[PDB]
Amino acid sequence: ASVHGTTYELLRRQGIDTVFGNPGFNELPFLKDFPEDFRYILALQEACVVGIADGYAQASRKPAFINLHSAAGTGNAMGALSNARTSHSPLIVTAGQQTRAMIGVEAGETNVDAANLPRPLVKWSYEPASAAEVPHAMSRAIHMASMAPQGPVYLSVPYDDWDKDADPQSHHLFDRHVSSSVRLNDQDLDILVKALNSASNPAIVLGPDVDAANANADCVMLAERLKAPVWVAPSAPRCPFPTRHPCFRGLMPAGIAAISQLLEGHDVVLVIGAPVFRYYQYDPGQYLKPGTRLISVTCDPLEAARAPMGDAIVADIGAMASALANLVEESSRQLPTAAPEPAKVDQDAGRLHPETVFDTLNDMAPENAIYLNESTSTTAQMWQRLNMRNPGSYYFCAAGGLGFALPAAIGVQLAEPERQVIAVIGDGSANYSISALWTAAQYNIPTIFVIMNNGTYGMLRAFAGLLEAENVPGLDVPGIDFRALAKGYGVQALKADNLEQLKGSLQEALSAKGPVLIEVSTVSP
Ligand SMILES: Cc1ncc(C[n+]2csc(CCOP(=O)(O)OP(=O)(O)O)c2C)c(N)n1
Numbered sequence: 001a002s003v004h005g006t007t008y009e010l011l012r013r014q015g016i017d018t019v020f021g022n023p024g025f026n027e028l029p030f031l032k033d034f035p036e037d038f039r040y041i042l043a044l045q046e047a048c049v050v051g052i053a054d055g056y057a058q059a060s061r062k063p064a065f066i067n068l069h070s071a072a073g074t075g076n077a078m079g080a081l082s083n084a085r086t087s088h089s090p091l092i093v094t095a096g097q098q099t100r101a102m103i104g105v106e107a108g109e110t111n112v113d114a115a116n117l118p119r120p121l122v123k124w125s126y127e128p129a130s131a132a133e134v135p136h137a138m139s140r141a142i143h144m145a146s147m148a149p150q151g152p153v154y155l156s157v158p159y160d161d162w163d164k165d166a167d168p169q170s171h172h173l174f175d176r177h178v179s180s181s182v183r184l185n186d187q188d189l190d191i192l193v194k195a196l197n198s199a200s201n202p203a204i205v206l207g208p209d210v211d212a213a214n215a216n217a218d219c220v221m222l223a224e225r226l227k228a229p230v231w232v233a234p235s236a237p238r239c240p241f242p243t244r245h246p247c248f249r250g251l252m253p254a255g256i257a258a259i260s261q262l263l264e265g266h267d268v269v270l271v272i273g274a275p276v277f278r279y280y281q282y283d284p285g286q287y288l289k290p291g292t293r294l295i296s297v298t299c300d301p302l303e304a305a306r307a308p309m310g311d312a313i314v315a316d317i318g319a320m321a322s323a324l325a326n327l328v329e330e331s332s333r334q335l336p337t338a339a340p341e342p343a344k345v346d347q348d349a350g351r352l353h354p355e356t357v358f359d360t361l362n363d364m365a366p367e368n369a370i371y372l373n374e375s376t377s378t379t380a381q382m383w384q385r386l387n388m389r390n391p392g393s394y395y396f397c398a399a400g401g402l403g404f405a406l407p408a409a410i411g412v413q414l415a416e417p418e419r420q421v422i423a424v425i426g427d428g429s430a431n432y433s434i435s436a437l438w439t440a441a442q443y444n445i446p447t448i449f450v451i452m453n454n455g456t457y458g459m460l461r462a463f464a465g466l467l468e469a470e471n472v473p474g475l476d477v478p479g480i481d482f483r484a485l486a487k488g489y490g491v492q493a494l495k496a497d498n499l500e501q502l503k504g505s506l507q508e509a510l511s512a513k514g515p516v517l518i519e520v521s522t523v524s525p
């Protein structure tokens, strides 16, 4: 009968059993009487709350539910919501509002013009006009988050609403099923399949929505049937393909001219689940060389509209990948040759080269490990050196916003308790969401954090070189003791100053029953 009771019934009926949150005054009437079939995951700062929720939703491929405090709690999470937008993460962000009777006077903790604060990062944002409509607004939020293209949504709820009577008609919300598992009509799909079958030198480019859809295995069958090389689209937030499969060609360069040069000679380039393209450095040139046609399958109208070249189909990635994989003819061409083994770099018995750490991780980690990357200057080496053969094995801040991997690795590990999660994070990136470590300690979530400590924002110094930007301040972060910080939050703390210490401490961390942070001294660039 109460809005509180009806809303938790709607959540449980829609598959939700976990609330990620940091509490406040406005949220106490929502969180009180907390149901025994739900669990509450506390984090100490809201960027950490949302990052944990985000990794959990991406790994579990289902929506995550979040409860923050009013404007200041929502505002603390806006960086994390920037990443969630670009990863298409289905996050239901709720926040408590002041009692309806004092919103106009703007009492303390009032979220002023609340629906505008999340924008423009969310796909829907709303504050209900009455308590009895809160379950309906929750239902809208749940489905807006889950419908393709998935993404974060925001709901602001005045705290006096929870005790009020819910609309009796709200029960019709509980079991609603909304599908967007759609694909191109048969006639046009046959034209596309005919164009793929008849390409003499096709190429495939895969983006994060493939891994989100668990379309990986169908994309493998597609690449094998067309005998086609496979790249992952630049600035990759996820891994959509086994990285040691013979077709895999790794991470594309993030420049306009670099990409059209690599494409040159491929007559049909099929892009699935990816923006066209997430360029980074400005590398002006031709978008495509003559003789290359590009076709993009995307779950997101905005991606289809913003591409500067190619044709596009707006459809569900799982349904389209499955349909294409089963319809294309087996080409008589020879399968592409696997990329060469990465080489061992020179390693003396002191500070570690990043290449060495990736090679050791690849040797020792389980074959179904899950990795997260926030070591920004070593991303290329990481993609070359980690054999990720299974789906959901890689996460990287989708919008480039640091502060994702440390909390996200906790959420992934929570969602996949049978797969060892290993977050490789630079010493600069580690600080943005450092307090997330406490959640791993308190809930005994056994994520492994590998801190790559070279004392500087290495990626920025390299980019500065690219931009001929000299005498830039703020690029060095000396004087951080990551073992002490780990201890501060109750997380076991190891160090690795050479290769033998690295091997030993990783093997310890694998066997450890709790979370473990390993501080690795890496070479300064
Ligand atoms: C929230 C946020 N603030 C700042 C940046 C800019 N940024 C991009 S890479 C980087 C350096 C990260 O340093 P570290 O994690 O130590 O790795 P390294 O580059 O040395 O491998 C910074 C500050 C960003 N992307 N996001």
Ligand SMILES: [Mg+2]
Binding pocket: 426, 427, 428, 452, 453, 454, 455, 456, 457, 458
């Ligand atoms: Mg660094």
